[PDB]
mmCIF file of all heavy atoms in Angstrom:
data_model
loop_
_atom_site.group_PDB
_atom_site.id
_atom_site.type_symbol
_atom_site.label_atom_id
_atom_site.label_comp_id
_atom_site.label_asym_id
_atom_site.label_seq_id
_atom_site.Cartn_x
_atom_site.Cartn_y
_atom_site.Cartn_z
ATOM 1 N N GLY A 80 104.020 86.069 97.534
ATOM 2 C CA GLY A 80 103.432 87.183 98.260
ATOM 3 C C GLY A 80 102.396 87.920 97.434
ATOM 4 O O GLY A 80 101.313 88.246 97.926
ATOM 5 N N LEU A 81 102.710 88.186 96.165
ATOM 6 C CA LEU A 81 101.742 88.818 95.277
ATOM 7 C C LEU A 81 100.510 87.941 95.093
ATOM 8 O O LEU A 81 99.383 88.448 94.994
ATOM 9 C CB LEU A 81 102.393 89.117 93.928
ATOM 10 C CG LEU A 81 103.503 90.167 93.959
ATOM 11 C CD1 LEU A 81 104.231 90.236 92.630
ATOM 12 C CD2 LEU A 81 102.901 91.524 94.317
ATOM 13 N N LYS A 82 100.704 86.620 95.053
ATOM 14 C CA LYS A 82 99.590 85.711 94.804
ATOM 15 C C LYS A 82 98.579 85.742 95.944
ATOM 16 O O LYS A 82 97.370 85.638 95.712
ATOM 17 C CB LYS A 82 100.109 84.290 94.587
ATOM 18 C CG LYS A 82 99.034 83.303 94.172
ATOM 19 C CD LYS A 82 99.524 81.868 94.226
ATOM 20 C CE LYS A 82 98.426 80.918 93.782
ATOM 21 N NZ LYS A 82 97.141 81.187 94.488
ATOM 22 N N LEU A 83 99.055 85.879 97.187
ATOM 23 C CA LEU A 83 98.137 85.948 98.321
ATOM 24 C C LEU A 83 97.364 87.260 98.339
ATOM 25 O O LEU A 83 96.245 87.311 98.860
ATOM 26 C CB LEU A 83 98.897 85.757 99.636
ATOM 27 C CG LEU A 83 99.521 84.371 99.858
ATOM 28 C CD1 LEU A 83 99.997 84.222 101.293
ATOM 29 C CD2 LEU A 83 98.534 83.258 99.501
ATOM 30 N N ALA A 84 97.941 88.331 97.792
ATOM 31 C CA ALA A 84 97.169 89.553 97.607
ATOM 32 C C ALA A 84 96.095 89.351 96.546
ATOM 33 O O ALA A 84 94.931 89.718 96.746
ATOM 34 C CB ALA A 84 98.095 90.711 97.232
ATOM 35 N N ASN A 85 96.465 88.740 95.416
ATOM 36 C CA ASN A 85 95.495 88.484 94.356
ATOM 37 C C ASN A 85 94.360 87.586 94.829
ATOM 38 O O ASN A 85 93.215 87.756 94.393
ATOM 39 C CB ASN A 85 96.192 87.866 93.146
ATOM 40 C CG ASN A 85 97.172 88.816 92.499
ATOM 41 O OD1 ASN A 85 97.044 90.033 92.626
ATOM 42 N ND2 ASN A 85 98.168 88.269 91.810
ATOM 43 N N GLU A 86 94.648 86.635 95.719
ATOM 44 C CA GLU A 86 93.590 85.774 96.237
ATOM 45 C C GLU A 86 92.600 86.565 97.083
ATOM 46 O O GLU A 86 91.386 86.348 96.995
ATOM 47 C CB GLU A 86 94.192 84.624 97.043
ATOM 48 N N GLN A 87 93.097 87.492 97.905
ATOM 49 C CA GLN A 87 92.199 88.303 98.721
ATOM 50 C C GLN A 87 91.467 89.345 97.887
ATOM 51 O O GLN A 87 90.338 89.726 98.223
ATOM 52 C CB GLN A 87 92.974 88.981 99.847
ATOM 53 C CG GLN A 87 93.582 88.021 100.851
ATOM 54 C CD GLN A 87 94.273 88.746 101.989
ATOM 55 O OE1 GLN A 87 93.631 89.183 102.944
ATOM 56 N NE2 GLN A 87 95.587 88.888 101.885
ATOM 57 N N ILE A 88 92.086 89.820 96.805
ATOM 58 C CA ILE A 88 91.424 90.780 95.927
ATOM 59 C C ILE A 88 90.258 90.120 95.204
ATOM 60 O O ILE A 88 89.154 90.672 95.138
ATOM 61 C CB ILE A 88 92.434 91.387 94.938
ATOM 62 C CG1 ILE A 88 93.461 92.242 95.685
ATOM 63 C CG2 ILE A 88 91.716 92.207 93.875
ATOM 64 C CD1 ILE A 88 94.553 92.803 94.808
ATOM 65 N N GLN A 89 90.486 88.927 94.650
ATOM 66 C CA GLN A 89 89.408 88.207 93.980
ATOM 67 C C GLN A 89 88.282 87.879 94.952
ATOM 68 O O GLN A 89 87.101 87.966 94.597
ATOM 69 C CB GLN A 89 89.952 86.932 93.333
ATOM 70 N N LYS A 90 88.630 87.515 96.187
ATOM 71 C CA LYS A 90 87.614 87.221 97.192
ATOM 72 C C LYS A 90 86.814 88.467 97.553
ATOM 73 O O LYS A 90 85.589 88.400 97.713
ATOM 74 C CB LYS A 90 88.272 86.623 98.438
ATOM 75 C CG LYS A 90 87.314 86.382 99.594
ATOM 76 C CD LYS A 90 88.041 85.886 100.835
ATOM 77 C CE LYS A 90 87.077 85.699 101.998
ATOM 78 N NZ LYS A 90 87.756 85.242 103.244
ATOM 79 N N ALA A 91 87.483 89.615 97.681
ATOM 80 C CA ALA A 91 86.796 90.837 98.082
ATOM 81 C C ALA A 91 85.928 91.410 96.970
ATOM 82 O O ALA A 91 85.084 92.269 97.245
ATOM 83 C CB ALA A 91 87.807 91.889 98.543
ATOM 84 N N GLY A 92 86.116 90.965 95.729
ATOM 85 C CA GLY A 92 85.286 91.424 94.633
ATOM 86 C C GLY A 92 86.043 91.674 93.343
ATOM 87 O O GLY A 92 85.427 91.952 92.309
ATOM 88 N N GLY A 93 87.372 91.593 93.390
ATOM 89 C CA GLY A 93 88.164 91.736 92.177
ATOM 90 C C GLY A 93 88.014 93.110 91.553
ATOM 91 O O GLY A 93 88.248 94.140 92.194
ATOM 92 N N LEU A 94 87.610 93.128 90.278
ATOM 93 C CA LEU A 94 87.442 94.382 89.549
ATOM 94 C C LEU A 94 86.424 95.306 90.203
ATOM 95 O O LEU A 94 86.464 96.520 89.970
ATOM 96 C CB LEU A 94 87.021 94.099 88.105
ATOM 97 C CG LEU A 94 88.080 93.518 87.167
ATOM 98 C CD1 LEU A 94 87.442 92.975 85.892
ATOM 99 C CD2 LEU A 94 89.127 94.578 86.841
ATOM 100 N N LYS A 95 85.511 94.764 91.006
ATOM 101 C CA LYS A 95 84.538 95.580 91.718
ATOM 102 C C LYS A 95 85.121 96.251 92.956
ATOM 103 O O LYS A 95 84.395 96.972 93.649
ATOM 104 C CB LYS A 95 83.326 94.728 92.112
ATOM 105 N N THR A 96 86.397 96.032 93.255
ATOM 106 C CA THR A 96 87.060 96.679 94.377
ATOM 107 C C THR A 96 88.029 97.738 93.871
ATOM 108 O O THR A 96 88.330 97.833 92.679
ATOM 109 C CB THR A 96 87.814 95.662 95.246
ATOM 110 O OG1 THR A 96 89.045 95.297 94.606
ATOM 111 C CG2 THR A 96 86.977 94.418 95.465
ATOM 112 N N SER A 97 88.512 98.544 94.805
ATOM 113 C CA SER A 97 89.603 99.480 94.562
ATOM 114 C C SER A 97 90.763 98.984 95.414
ATOM 115 O O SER A 97 90.866 99.304 96.598
ATOM 116 C CB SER A 97 89.206 100.909 94.901
ATOM 117 O OG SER A 97 90.306 101.788 94.747
ATOM 118 N N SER A 98 91.622 98.172 94.809
ATOM 119 C CA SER A 98 92.701 97.503 95.514
ATOM 120 C C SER A 98 94.037 98.113 95.118
ATOM 121 O O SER A 98 94.258 98.455 93.953
ATOM 122 C CB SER A 98 92.700 95.999 95.215
ATOM 123 O OG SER A 98 91.498 95.393 95.665
ATOM 124 N N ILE A 99 94.922 98.252 96.100
ATOM 125 C CA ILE A 99 96.261 98.781 95.891
ATOM 126 C C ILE A 99 97.251 97.820 96.534
ATOM 127 O O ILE A 99 97.074 97.419 97.690
ATOM 128 C CB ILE A 99 96.409 100.201 96.470
ATOM 129 C CG1 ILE A 99 95.510 101.184 95.711
ATOM 130 C CG2 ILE A 99 97.860 100.656 96.426
ATOM 131 N N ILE A 100 98.277 97.438 95.782
ATOM 132 C CA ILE A 100 99.335 96.563 96.271
ATOM 133 C C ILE A 100 100.600 97.389 96.435
ATOM 134 O O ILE A 100 101.021 98.083 95.501
ATOM 135 C CB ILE A 100 99.575 95.375 95.325
ATOM 136 C CG1 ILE A 100 98.407 94.389 95.407
ATOM 137 C CG2 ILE A 100 100.901 94.695 95.662
ATOM 138 C CD1 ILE A 100 98.475 93.274 94.384
ATOM 139 N N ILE A 101 101.206 97.309 97.617
ATOM 140 C CA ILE A 101 102.439 98.019 97.939
ATOM 141 C C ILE A 101 103.463 96.982 98.374
ATOM 142 O O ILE A 101 103.363 96.424 99.475
ATOM 143 C CB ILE A 101 102.224 99.072 99.033
ATOM 144 C CG1 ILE A 101 101.093 100.028 98.634
ATOM 145 C CG2 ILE A 101 103.519 99.821 99.310
ATOM 146 C CD1 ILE A 101 100.797 101.099 99.665
ATOM 147 N N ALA A 102 104.449 96.722 97.520
ATOM 148 C CA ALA A 102 105.474 95.720 97.788
ATOM 149 C C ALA A 102 106.745 96.390 98.296
ATOM 150 O O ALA A 102 107.271 97.304 97.653
ATOM 151 C CB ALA A 102 105.779 94.902 96.532
ATOM 152 N N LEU A 103 107.233 95.927 99.446
ATOM 153 C CA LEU A 103 108.477 96.400 100.051
ATOM 154 C C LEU A 103 109.529 95.317 99.852
ATOM 155 O O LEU A 103 109.400 94.216 100.401
ATOM 156 C CB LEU A 103 108.292 96.702 101.537
ATOM 157 C CG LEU A 103 107.733 98.046 102.022
ATOM 158 C CD1 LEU A 103 108.807 99.122 101.998
ATOM 159 C CD2 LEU A 103 106.517 98.480 101.220
ATOM 160 N N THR A 104 110.569 95.624 99.079
ATOM 161 C CA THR A 104 111.582 94.624 98.764
ATOM 162 C C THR A 104 112.802 95.314 98.173
ATOM 163 O O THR A 104 112.773 96.503 97.844
ATOM 164 C CB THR A 104 111.045 93.569 97.791
ATOM 165 O OG1 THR A 104 112.068 92.605 97.508
ATOM 166 C CG2 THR A 104 110.608 94.229 96.493
ATOM 167 N N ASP A 105 113.879 94.543 98.027
ATOM 168 C CA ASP A 105 115.071 95.001 97.328
ATOM 169 C C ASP A 105 115.079 94.601 95.859
ATOM 170 O O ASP A 105 116.022 94.946 95.141
ATOM 171 C CB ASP A 105 116.336 94.477 98.026
ATOM 172 C CG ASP A 105 116.347 92.965 98.185
ATOM 173 O OD1 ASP A 105 115.415 92.283 97.702
ATOM 174 O OD2 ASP A 105 117.305 92.456 98.804
ATOM 175 N N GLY A 106 114.056 93.885 95.397
ATOM 176 C CA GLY A 106 113.990 93.503 93.999
ATOM 177 C C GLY A 106 115.124 92.623 93.526
ATOM 178 O O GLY A 106 115.365 92.537 92.319
ATOM 179 N N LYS A 107 115.836 91.972 94.443
ATOM 180 C CA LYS A 107 116.922 91.060 94.089
ATOM 181 C C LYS A 107 116.321 89.670 93.936
ATOM 182 O O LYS A 107 116.230 88.896 94.891
ATOM 183 C CB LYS A 107 118.022 91.091 95.142
ATOM 184 N N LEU A 108 115.893 89.355 92.720
ATOM 185 C CA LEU A 108 115.226 88.096 92.438
ATOM 186 C C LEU A 108 116.167 87.154 91.700
ATOM 187 O O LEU A 108 117.156 87.572 91.092
ATOM 188 C CB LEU A 108 113.953 88.329 91.622
ATOM 189 C CG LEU A 108 113.005 89.375 92.214
ATOM 190 C CD1 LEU A 108 111.735 89.468 91.387
ATOM 191 C CD2 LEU A 108 112.677 89.055 93.664
ATOM 192 N N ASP A 109 115.852 85.866 91.772
ATOM 193 C CA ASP A 109 116.725 84.842 91.225
ATOM 194 C C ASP A 109 115.890 83.754 90.573
ATOM 195 O O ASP A 109 114.746 83.505 90.964
ATOM 196 C CB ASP A 109 117.617 84.220 92.304
ATOM 197 N N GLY A 110 116.478 83.109 89.578
ATOM 198 C CA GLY A 110 115.870 81.936 88.980
ATOM 199 C C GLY A 110 114.603 82.272 88.228
ATOM 200 O O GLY A 110 114.595 83.127 87.337
ATOM 201 N N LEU A 111 113.516 81.585 88.587
ATOM 202 C CA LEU A 111 112.215 81.772 87.964
ATOM 203 C C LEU A 111 111.410 82.907 88.579
ATOM 204 O O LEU A 111 110.406 83.321 87.989
ATOM 205 C CB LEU A 111 111.403 80.477 88.065
ATOM 206 C CG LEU A 111 111.930 79.273 87.290
ATOM 207 C CD1 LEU A 111 111.145 78.031 87.642
ATOM 208 C CD2 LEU A 111 111.832 79.562 85.807
ATOM 209 N N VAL A 112 111.818 83.406 89.749
ATOM 210 C CA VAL A 112 111.025 84.433 90.431
ATOM 211 C C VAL A 112 110.842 85.686 89.588
ATOM 212 O O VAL A 112 109.740 86.256 89.604
ATOM 213 C CB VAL A 112 111.618 84.722 91.817
ATOM 214 C CG1 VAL A 112 110.720 85.684 92.588
ATOM 215 C CG2 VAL A 112 111.813 83.419 92.586
#
C-alpha cells in the first residue's frame, strides 16, 4: 500500500510536490512486513 503511494508521488513530481501519506491500520504486522 505504501509503495503505490510512493509510485504516485514520484509520478506527480516527488520532492517537487507536497505529499502527505495517511495510513489507517491496526499495525499488526507479521513476517517480513
Side-chain angles (χ1 to χ4, degrees), residues 80-85 87-88 90-94 96-98 100-106 108 110-112:
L81 294 171
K82 186 191 181 310
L83 294 191
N85 295 336
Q87 296 183 82
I88 294 176
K90 175 184 178 181
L94 288 166
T96 78
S97 176
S98 298
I100 289 173
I101 306 179
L103 276 281
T104 180
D105 55 4
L108 308 184
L111 294 172
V112 186

